[PDB]
Design a protein around this ligand. Structure first.
Ligand SMILES: [Mg+2]
Ligand SMILES: [Mg+2]
Ligand SMILES: [Mg+2]
Lengths: 104, 67, 72, 55, 55, 98, 171
RNA sequence: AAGGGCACCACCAGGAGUGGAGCCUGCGGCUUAAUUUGACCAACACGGGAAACCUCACCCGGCCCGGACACGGACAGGAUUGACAGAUUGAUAGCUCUUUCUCGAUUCCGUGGGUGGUGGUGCAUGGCCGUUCUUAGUUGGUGGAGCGAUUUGUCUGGUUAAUUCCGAUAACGAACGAGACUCUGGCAUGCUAACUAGUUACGCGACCCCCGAGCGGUCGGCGUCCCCCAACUUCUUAGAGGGACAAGUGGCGUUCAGCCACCCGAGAUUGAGCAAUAACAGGUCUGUGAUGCCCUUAGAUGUCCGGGGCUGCACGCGCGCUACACUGACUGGCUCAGCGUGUGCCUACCCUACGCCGGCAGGCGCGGGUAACCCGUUGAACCCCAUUCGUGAUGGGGAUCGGGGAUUGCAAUUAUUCCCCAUGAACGAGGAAUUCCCAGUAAGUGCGGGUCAUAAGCUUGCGUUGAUUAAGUCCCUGCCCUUUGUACACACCGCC
């Protein structure tokens, strides 16, 4: 054996992250691995507000830069071993994974 | 400008002649008229300098003074 | 929220809970004749207030106020 | 005398340069190389160490 | 001078211990999220990092 | 520049192992991240590489805060006759597996 | 964990690495028709793709420059040996890359071609390759103190709103 | 010059104010060895500029070459490199002097030639940014007027936030900008789900109960993915979708564009981001291994180190903070947030729970957190409820100053910051003038981010409480358009 695995996915764009979640669970459903629905962690918004001008002169304008980090969690809980079963990741650029055993 | 001090004079090395600070006798008998700095890194190759009151190796092989 | 906001969230949720309870379990003929009393008194009892806030802008203390300027 | 006490020009449209003014005057009507055009232009050591120190 | 005063003044903190990872400047430095980049150093490379302007 | 010979040969043989050399623009860094155990600081590295650039044995590129010197063919044979190698040994960037 | 870094600092670090790698390759392969870089990172190894209009110059004789560039980025970013690989790929529709077209314009201007002659030549090339519109602006001083700006436009050009992000290529 | 139109950086009607007072800060001036410097609506809490050192560019001093490379010298009989001691120096800089060693081709000297510079020029430039201007303006094709440059299109008029549309019509069909678009807020008891979010139900508990309440009440008590040992997504999170279009009704209108009122509805005008043709000799060479030219380059305008300065005070001005009080202050109790940060390439600096000591600022152990897992149910302030004060420069105010104690830092004096005890100054609502503003807005009120070893009276956001007046006008101030005049066209900073 009994094993349980968790795959976390981090990305900056929603469309890619949703695609890699979708085909990961789709492959596992066909593979009769029990899958817990992809839970969406709250999005991290890294906000940096600088000043537009490179000098001191101007009318005091500020530029708000924004960065969004989206996080997902997918749990695979099959009665038998899992790591030897599923060995493909099928990732597109901009998506970072981190495999973790459910004990941690 | 108009600096109050005159231009500082940099040290000019003496450009000494050959060392020759060791002598032989009776057709050749080595006698060191200087000291050897006894640090292991220094070795016996280098000779500890002799001053009017202290002995200091050419490397940092310590310094011994006789009072 | 704050004290006032929690108060309005209380009175709104209380008036909503039993009117939805009546709709679920008894006839809505009774629901309609208690709902018309609620809306005729205060519509905020059954309809949330949409206004929340407004973002602050980079030229003044708040959303719309601007910093004092001088000419001389 | 064209500046204030601070040092700013009291006539910013009076060019202080004899070579150039407010307008850009094109040299020779935009001809010559390195110039704005004109209408005419419009139309291994590690193993070596090993064998060295093996003996 | 020699090896005991050329870099003797401590720089484990303060504005002199950090500089622009792009142009070595020591003013208007952004340290948030470990950026270690200028105000102007950053506005040039902001899109390459991924800091998009949404609002 | 007052590089001791053990430092100079260490830099040159590293540059022969790979024709490239990356060094941050920092005179005050006590040790180069590579060849740190040779105890030659980053200052001696940069001044050594600027002399080769002036002589034309190496070509220099500069990113944000890092040099990226690349060994040239004019500097290939100079490094041969300086470190005394026959014309059989080539840098890893010049030849790999062939 | 403790030896790891928070995801907020990790993603910022990835953007910093991409920006510096872009800038270094801009300063290195500019005359080689450098266009852009797409990096695909998997935990086993990182792949860096150099999109350029001329692969046979980005890679040297017998591929010497590729292994030269891989080695010089291993030493900079501290990559494990063999954990980063660089590919050179020729970009289709070279006339639709603003970076490449602006590079070609600088090459002409350094050669001494007239500004009108060079800019009209590149506008014809962009429209020939197929584009709704294009616009080049050359600003600065030539043969005189006073600076000037020349603007060469043709076709459709939008300036405002979100569609500018995915419809306009700028250099 | 005339005529239209628009705008809370214009007014009207008002709200809070500023200017009046003390202080923090930025300019000017004075003084200085230096008090570095840029900038004068669109400069003056701006250069993310809250400077002890660094920063630093300024002043006073003292080291270093980190002057590549080429040529010629001198040189293993020494080109040269460092140095213990004493003086000398601020210095434990062999910086120099007495002193003898050490280093070994790496250097040194000379001639050419580099190189670096927060040195100058933003009126030599790039890029970026600001403003005109977020106003609504701007330009092709074909056709018409014309010999041309050009013009019509792009307009009398109605309408709109908008040359936004409708209508007249030598124009028809378009393009940019506006709009559209992206993000955000507001509704989904509809969908997909969640031990890093929970909620109901149930099982044990802990207490109040007993008048008996008994499927009684409370529990942020423990549990039911401790995977066999409940279900579900309402609350929370985030994806896909829906939803609002002047849609329906009534009235006005060329009965067109549209406008007003009402119903149902979460919403019948949520805020931003982006933003044209061009101009401003607008600001930046002190952001840059952006950069031309000029200056300097070994007694340096390079670079390092030490100290000082950027704070210095007869005065003037700008942004602000705190107040003048009882609509209050003090004391105590009760009691509710949301943005959002968090342990480091260099890089040394994290958020802190819990216990122990002190009154405090603090100190010491034990952990947790690289994070919806820990801080943290962020027990925030205001507010609410009780006490005292009583119109008095008073228990308002907390400037100024003395003494003491901590914290960071190598370094705290010209006080870094904080804490305790002392003094208690003006200020009794502020002239002429002048700023910002239309709904979760102003205003009161705290909290995060940046700056940061120490740091907020600044700024950037967030939440809490939460209004008065108005649905208009060209009167003031400006801006735009049309007509008009022109000897201007570098375009009134003109010409003469
Ligand atoms: Mg728009
Ligand atoms: Mg007191
Ligand atoms: Mg006339």
């Amino acid at each position: 054996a009994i094993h349980r695995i968790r795959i976390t996915l981090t990305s900056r764009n929603v469309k890619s992250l949703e695609k890699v979640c979708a085909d990961l669970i789709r492959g596992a459903k066909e593979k009769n691995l029990k899958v817990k629905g992809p839970v969406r962690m709250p999005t991290k918004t890294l906000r940096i507000t600088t000043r537009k001008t490179p000098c001191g002169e101007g009318s005091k304008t500020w530029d708000r830069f924004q960065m969004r980090i989206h996080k997902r969690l997918i749990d695979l809980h099959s009665p038998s071993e899992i790591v030897k079963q599923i060995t493909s990741i099928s990732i597109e650029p901009g998506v970072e994974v981190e495999v973790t055993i459910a004990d941690a | 400008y108009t600096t109050p001090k005159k231009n500082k004079h940099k040290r000019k090395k003496v450009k000494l002649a050959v060392l020759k600070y060791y002598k032989v006798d009776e057709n050749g008998k080595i006698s060191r008229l200087r000291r050897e700095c006894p640090s292991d890194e220094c070795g016996a190759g280098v000779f500890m300098a002799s001053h009017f009151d202290r002995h200091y190796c050419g490397k940092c092989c310590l310094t011994y003074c006789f009072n | 929220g704050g004290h006032v906001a929690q108060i309005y969230a209380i009175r709104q949720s209380i008036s909503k809970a039993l009117v939805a309870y009546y709709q679920k379990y008894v006839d809505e003929a009774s629901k309609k004749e208690i709902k018309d009393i609620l809306i005729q008194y205060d519509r905020t009892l059954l309809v949330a207030d949409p206004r929340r806030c407004e973002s602050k802008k980079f030229g003044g203390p708040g959303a719309r106020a601007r910093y004092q300027k001088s000419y001389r | 005398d064209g500046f204030d006490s601070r040092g700013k020009r009291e006539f910013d449209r009076h060019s202080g340069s004899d070579r150039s003014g407010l307008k850009h005057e094109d040299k020779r009507g935009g001809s010559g190389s390195h110039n704005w055009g004109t209408v005419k232009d419009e139309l291994t050591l590690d193993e070596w160490k090993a064998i060295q120190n093996k003996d | 001078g020699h090896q005991q005063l050329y870099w003797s003044h401590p720089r484990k903190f303060g504005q002199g211990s950090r500089s622009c990872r792009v142009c070595s400047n020591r003013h208007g430095l952004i340290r948030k999220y470990g950026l270690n980049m200028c105000r102007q150093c950053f506005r040039q490379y902001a899109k390459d990092i991924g800091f998009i302007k949404l609002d | 520049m007052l590089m001791p010979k053990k430092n100079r040969i260490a830099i040159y043989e590293l540059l022969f192992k790979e024709g490239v050399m990356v060094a941050k623009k920092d005179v005050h860094m006590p040790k180069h991240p590579e060849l740190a155990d040779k105890n030659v600081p980053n200052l001696h590295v940069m001044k050594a590489m600027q002399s080769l650039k002036s002589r034309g044995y190496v070509k220099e590129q500069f990113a944000w805060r890092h040099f990226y010197w690349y060994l040239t063919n004019e500097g290939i044979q100079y490094l041969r006759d300086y470190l005394h190698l026959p014309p059989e040994i080539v840098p890893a960037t010049l030849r790999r597996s062939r | 964990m403790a030896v790891q870094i928070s995801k907020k600092r990790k993603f910022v670090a990835d953007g910093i690495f991409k920006a510096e790698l872009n800038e270094f390759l801009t300063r290195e392969l500019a005359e080689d028709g450098y266009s852009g870089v797409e990096v695909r990172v998997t935990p086993t190894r990182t792949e860096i793709i150099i999109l350029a209009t001329r692969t046979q110059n980005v890679l040297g004789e017998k591929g010497r420059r590729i292994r030269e560039l891989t080695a010089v980025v291993q030493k900079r970013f501290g990559f494990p040996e063999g954990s980063v690989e660089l590919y050179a790929e020729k970009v289709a529709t070279r006339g639709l890359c603003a970076i490449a077209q602006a590079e070609s314009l600088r090459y002409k201007l350094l050669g001494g071609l007239a500004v009108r002659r060079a800019c009209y030549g590149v506008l014809r090339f962009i429209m020939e390759s197929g584009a709704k519109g294009c616009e080049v602006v050359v600003s600065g001083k030539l043969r005189g103190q006073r600076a000037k700006s020349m603007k060469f436009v043709d076709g459709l050009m939008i300036h405002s709103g979100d569609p500018v992000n995915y419809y306009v290529d700028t250099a």
